[PDB]
């Protein structure tokens, strides 16, 4: 199998969560693009812009408390 | 006589010593059915590796 870490998994557990959120985010934007004056999708485009905001940050924040705990452990050994 | 053949030939023994016969050599073998190297496959987002 592919090479893979513990902050991969972590990682990773947020992309398999959201199942199709990356492609409907850009999706909506297309859409929106076309016609910004409508206003079901000026709507629809915050609530998903909105969603994808919000996992980015949680994503990130996790990763940097397991690092954290981590080095704590590593730097007992000596 | 024997003084001197016993004489000789254990200076003769010892002067031989340095001479070096032990010797390594290099074999080239192709592989006709296989990739020689470690071998890389993708999948559909990863890479996978075997020995």
New interface residues.
Partial sequence: ????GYLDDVSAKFDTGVDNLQTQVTEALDKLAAKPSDPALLAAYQSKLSEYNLYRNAQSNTVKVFKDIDAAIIQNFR | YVDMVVNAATMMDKQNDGIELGRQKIGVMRLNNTFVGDRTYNLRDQKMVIP
């Fill in positions: 199998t592919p090479w893979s």
